[PDB]
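re: ur msg from earlier - yeah i can do the magnesium ion complex, just paste it... oh wait u already did. ok heres what im feeding in:
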Amino acid sequence: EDHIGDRRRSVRSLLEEAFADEMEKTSYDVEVIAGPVHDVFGDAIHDIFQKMMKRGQAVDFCHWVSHLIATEIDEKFSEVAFRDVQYNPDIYVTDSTTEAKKLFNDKIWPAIDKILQQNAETCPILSEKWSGIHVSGDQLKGQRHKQEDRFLAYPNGQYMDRGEDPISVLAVFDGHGGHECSQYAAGHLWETWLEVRKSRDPSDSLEDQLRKSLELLDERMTVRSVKECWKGGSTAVCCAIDMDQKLMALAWLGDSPGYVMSNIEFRQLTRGHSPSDEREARRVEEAGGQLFVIGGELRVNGVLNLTRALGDVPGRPMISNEPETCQVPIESSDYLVLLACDGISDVFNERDLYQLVEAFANDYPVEDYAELSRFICTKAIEAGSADNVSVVIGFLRPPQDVWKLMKH
Ligand SMILES: [Mg+2]
Ligand SMILES: [Mg+2]
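and the outut:
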């Protein structure tokens, strides 16, 4: 109503588009290793999310609907309530999770099918209204064999667990040596974030809460990484935005950057954990590592061009898992936050990014704002980036304000 783009649309409208092929089959009368129990639900949500993004929906709807679908499957089809299992550091059960994972795959359409059979008059889910800041998120594989980046863009808790928490959380995770760590981070950050929010002391700043959620995420990831012998790791850059308090926190491990765009420029908020940074080099040396130039750049023990990461258990202590953080007041002249992987910053500097937003806002109408992140990814590949590329954007001021700002 007073909304723009897909935020104008009803749940039914969005589902019927996403599952148009399945509805058509119905109309034609067609009958259309093992992880731990404590990870099943979040694992399922991430798998559903990836499938929903392939069906062409906006990232925020994909987050919301993935939790809905997983919840519906868990309630209607699963013997075990995986959504109610709490992580316990001394418990790790793998009993029948293989069957469970298959269930969360097979029952996606059945879950949605049953919802679409109902009427909004007696089905509350169909009346959902969309809250929170506007976001944009997407990625491209680029000149790579696998997509090892993951990302999150939650306007607030409505899109995580369909609850009431008002804080937005955005993230990008750039995996190396596999996608297991970045996939895990994407599957479970919402869980550790909401756990921290629920248990927070009054003395915990937003910055502390965000840091704690990443510490807890790495703790859970570490257990599974060791049990399954994962070899790789992931960067993280995460942002929590509290619009009421006019505060934004960032936490990062590695070289995926975060920026704020004001009326005049993009400004980088993160400080890359690369061996060329004298501070990081000292941390590596103190941890017993060495820095060698192998190929064209400085690498820790000749392998990693990063000094901090999620996962990388085999690389500890030379590679640190300690997040760096900051907290920044949000001023009235701050327009958007943008998080990306290094695939973007390899080719674009701050001025390039500003000019890309400027170009998009002059070439496309505001109703297409959700496509801005994909635009930047596509432009990065055109500019010769040779990596996976991912971008998430949070609109601190509404898309209308950004378009007004940029209009020639
Ligand atoms: Mg990578
Ligand atoms: Mg990368």
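cool cool. The longest helix spans residues 206-228. ping me if u need the other ligands too
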